[PDB]
């Protein structure tokens, strides 16, 4: 059982896999190993978790700064916002699924 990371995340190499999607993040923190908060939503509306988030129980396994991470998620069709974090450093992007 781990605690969620309290630092800030980054959006590096932007991306599909004929259904699922992949995104790489960079954690600027030393509290590792913590749970990486990742989800999809429709934002400014109590970010209700939509989608599936395929990657199993993502955790920053090391206490070293600027670790890289591959995360694959199941975003819904249409426009969406891949949220990576929890708190005030929660980053958000935009997605569109094959319409």
């Amino acid at each position: 059982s781990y605690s969620l990371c309290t630092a800030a995340f980054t959006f590096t190499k932007i991306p599909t896999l004929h259904g699922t999607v992949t995104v790489e993040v960079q954690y600027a923190g030393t509290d590792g190993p913590c749970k990486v908060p990742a989800q999809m939503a429709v934002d400014m509306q109590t970010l209700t978790p939509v989608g599936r988030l395929i990657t199993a129980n993502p955790v920053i396994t090391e206490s070293t700064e600027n670790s890289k991470m591959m995360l694959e998620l199941d975003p819904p069709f249409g426009d969406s916002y891949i949220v990576i974090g929890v708190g005030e450093k929660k980053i958000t992007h935009h997605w569109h699924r094959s319409g």
Partner: antibody, heavy 122, light 108 residues
Framework: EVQLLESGGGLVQPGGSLRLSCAASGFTFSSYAMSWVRQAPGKGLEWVSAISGSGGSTYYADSVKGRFTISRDNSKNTLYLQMNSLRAEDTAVYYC???????????????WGQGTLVTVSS | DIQMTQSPSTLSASVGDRVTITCRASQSISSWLAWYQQKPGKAPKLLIYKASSLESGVPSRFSGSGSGTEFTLTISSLQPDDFATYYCQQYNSYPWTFGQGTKVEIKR
């Protein structure tokens, strides 16, 4: 109407234990993260511990780690802080503050209670 | 532990004057920085988050600025109820550390 009310403090011998409570009332507790911040009399604010809205995540300060335990009872809208190995330097007014944003980690302390005093001495 | 140190430790000024408090970090924390006010015997109050964003209810004379390492809190025109001790806090990472404070006093 965010009202917070700390309870459960007072005088305890060094090495003893005491547990604080905090009855939150004016917001959806099952959605916001709460923290414990203390203030030694005559000094500044030191951060003690913070817990998540679900309780799955719980953070502590090094001077406190392995001796205190933060807990939550989302059914009764109260928040606790179990202090089991109190020393003299833990003498402070302990505050119960709530995250400025729901489903967070305790980055900011939006509302504060007035506190409860713990004096650890022989 | 990110070290917040404020400056100065004690301020004296008269009503109407502009006062500026300072807070330097041990490392770069972009804009993750709050400010609180504490009146003697009362609990602290959140005044400004993310460096320059005022919290609802805080007057317009309070303003915030700064990024990375050096942030300042400014009161455009000191008023008789603005005298308190002011703390600094970075929430860039855990454990959320504070500064030592800055006591604003009224000249007369």
């Amino acid at each position: 109407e965010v009202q917070l009310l700390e309870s459960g403090g007072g005088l305890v011998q060094p090495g003893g234990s005491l547990r604080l409570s905090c009855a939150a009332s004016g917001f959806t507790f099952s959605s916001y993260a709460m923290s414990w911040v203390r203030q030694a009399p005559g000094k500044g604010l030191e951060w003690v511990s913070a817990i998540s809205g679900s309780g799955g995540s719980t953070y502590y300060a090094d001077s406190v780690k392995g001796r205190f335990t933060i807990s939550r009872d989302n059914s009764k809208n109260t928040l606790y802080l179990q202090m089991n190995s109190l020393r003299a330097e833990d003498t402070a007014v302990y505050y119960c503050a709530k995250d400025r944003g729901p489903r967070g980690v305790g980055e900011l302390f939006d509302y504060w209670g007035q506190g409860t005093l713990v004096t650890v001495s022989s | 532990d990110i070290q917040m140190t404020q400056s100065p430790s004690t301020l004296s000024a008269s009503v109407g004057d502009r006062v500026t408090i300072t807070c330097r970090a041990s490392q770069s924390i972009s804009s993750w920085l709050a400010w609180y006010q504490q009146k003697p015997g009362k609990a602290p109050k959140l005044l400004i988050y993310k460096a320059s964003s005022l919290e609802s209810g805080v007057p317009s004379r309070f303003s915030g600025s700064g990024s990375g390492t050096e942030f300042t809190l400014t009161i455009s025109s000191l008023q008789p109820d603005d005298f308190a001790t002011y703390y600094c806090q970075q929430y860039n990472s855990y454990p959320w550390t504070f500064g030592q404070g800055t006591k604003v006093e009224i000249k007369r």
